[PDB]
């Protein structure tokens, strides 16, 4: 020890590297280290090695963002604990069916931990110190001490009381955010395990390690651990990790690993429904990942350690500070040079000149910007839209592009069958609209057994496609029996296989059900006829939902899928929602681009993108359809502002073999079809590299990678807020997509209003003291208190309560404070402010009842003079004129009379402040009460010259047209104008 710099820290974290290198020795040999600093580039993080309790061997671990890193003496490095058993063979978990004994469970627990999502409950002394130990409140405690020196008790009290409001609002924001995360990871539950010889023992869910076995109750419940199913079957509701409320099917793990075997894994938190065994006495699961290593542990660990959003946090910090410093120092050296000309004794010139740098730092600035964000999150919640991080609400007003998923999002999630189109030897015999009429053969057993719905509590429950084609024929559900669901439906492979058998068969048959251009590629080519592309387009370009069916007899693996015989097409109808078409046309009107992103068929997705309005009539679009070979694009025009339509594999050829042709497609492509759930994610990440600000409105599991990758992701038709998306709407409509844009624009406008107000606020009171430091007549105590506490804090907390508009328009919020329409406002609003203070001061000098002030006493001591009363009365109205001037909401917010507490406060404070002029309270506030003539009515006729002169000045400045591209996409669009890309 003896290297601590605590003796030099009591006489003063700007540079973390220049401070930790002196408080601790720069020592190598991390086997014998105690603290580790964790970054090459980026920001620094100092981590403490933990409190190792390993008796047999020393254990050196440390938490870092929940992720334990472990020390290994045979490699001499810090490897991640999640990495440990990575690469484990598929037969090892089947040798792990008996679990772990108590001699090996305790060893495991130390390495992995208690399997708990660690949301720490911060105490109020631990949380007041986390907020008050900041430079800003360090300057506000310097301000409480500096005024107290001059005996301004009242002024000092409100610097404490405003900062106590500012602290307690940041302790409401933080404590309620962490209570939201803590209420969705609470999984205390009794769990039965198996030991090496016949034990259950009823262990707790916070006592589980990887490698341990786990039996599952028939009734089901939340999944405590990220297990792996080895023996049995179960139906899982994965709405807490994906978004689909439909149950999925979980096949047991074969013999031969968490993302590949996605249909074999029971993720943590997702509820299980039936959990049948069918092989032994009970159903077995083997634990793979625990608390911060699992998914729902890695989603929470990305919530509370987020990524920087791609928007400037108010654009300029340093530039604004520099401007303030030049502006506020030129008013500071003025009071140096003027108070010396008024012959101050130079002891009080250092306490007066340090009071001008105090008034330009308003104490209510973090409180006014906190409620600007709490009001925004509270307005979305009443409209049904939820939120986790309210720092992305301001990204809603910057959306230049929104991507949508077609089925269940633009269209209705429910289906209705139209009838099968059978096949009898390359024929396409015509459609059977009631499929309980065609005879018992391979096709009638196909659509009655190739499903995954389950008999659960008096109603069948499953996929909305599978619920309809079984209802289309109407058999009972528990004569053909299902041997094994050989392949559950995955969205990336676009098919589903079921092996069936029935009494009276020589051999079982193997049915399939998938997308028509993928099954017909798979089937024996001597069965699919020559007009399959024409018989498909006759249905799928009328707006129908078509899947195919095929069979093969079996005399397991995926030998089932291949050398099939095509049975028939199943045709379903998918109608748009009633709310889809006005929303897409509202986005197209306001120059926000809308993009179809779906996994469904191409000709179906084009006839949906016309019926709702991605492509208006008399607008040409081109289907590209690159070949699977590395040849060209071939362009097939569609006849029914260029648009483009792509297939899934077409987007794969262009991103891998035409890399310079890819930006010309993304600036004008509107329909993307047959997209894999990892190709949707790739499209969002490729659009953001063109410097778009993309949105994403989706539904279900295939959109999960795209919702995370987007700047704004919205998930539909869910309760409270899921971990999956930043914004989780619960409306089952896309009309929550303009609500986020419209709330996002007003919050980006009511934040720049509070910025302009506190700038116009500080400056007004700064000049109102500069007029009173000359003539040695500084402002009162209670007057200062009223100006800072009663007037200004009321019209800044209530200022941002207004609400967003009702109709979007094609104008964006400016996104930059220091610009020429804003500095021309702040210059010309303040030329006026000084004109009606100096002009109201030089006019009271020329009155016959006027006596000057006794200059040779002091500044605060014995002066209730006339020079204070004619300035305080004419300055206290400036804070209500400017509170309603910058609160303009005609393009973005609303007119301010809708905000009822911002009318009642702004009229009661404009009525008391008349009673301090005409009718007084002059004991307090030290007002010169001897004014008895009709000079009162001349000052009120000068306030009205400001109540009109400020509203009628910004209306001129809004009509400012200066007569005197950076974004990549804009450049491409210009190039496209000159030369069209498709021809
Ligand atoms: N339950 C199912 N069984 C078999 N095939 C399906 C099922 N659901 C969808 N498909 C087919 O798989 C393809 C891709 O699936 P998916 O991406 O989930 O489609 P969607 O965008 O309509 O949700 C679709 O063209 C659809 O025809
Ligand atoms: Mg689907
Ligand atoms: Mg969907």
Numbering used by the authors: 60 to 71, 113 to 139, 143 to 146, 148 to 360, 365 to 582, 610 to 613, 620 to 696, 708 to 779, ...
Publication text:
ATP13A2 belongs to the orphan P5B adenosine triphosphatases (ATPase) family and has been established as a lysosomal polyamine exporter to maintain the normal function of lysosomes and mitochondria. Here, using single-particle cryo-EM, we present the structures of full-length human ATP13A2 in three distinct conformations including an E1 state (apo), an E1P-ADP state with ATP and Mg2+, and an E2-Pi state with SPM, phosphatidic acid (PA), and phosphatidylinositol(3,5)bisphosphate [PI(3,5)P2]. The structure of the human ATP13A2 adopts the typical P-type ATPase fold with overall dimensions of 125 Å × 75 Å × 70 Å, including ten transmembrane (TM) helices and three conserved cytoplasmic domains [N (nucleotide-binding) domain; A (actuator) domain; and P (phosphorylation) domain].
The purified human ATP13A2 was subjected to cryo-EM analysis under three different conditions, apo state, E1P-ADP state (with Mg2+, ATP, and SPM), and E2-Pi state [with PI(3,5)P2, PA, and SPM], and at overall resolutions of 3.3, 3.0, and 3.6 Å, respectively. The E1P-ADP state map showed well-resolved densities to allow confident de novo model building for most of the protein regions, the other two state models were reconstructed according to the E1P-ADP state structure. Mutagenesis of the aspartate (D513A) resulted in a reduced activity compared with wild-type proteins, highlighting the essential role of this conserved aspartate in ATP13A2 activity.
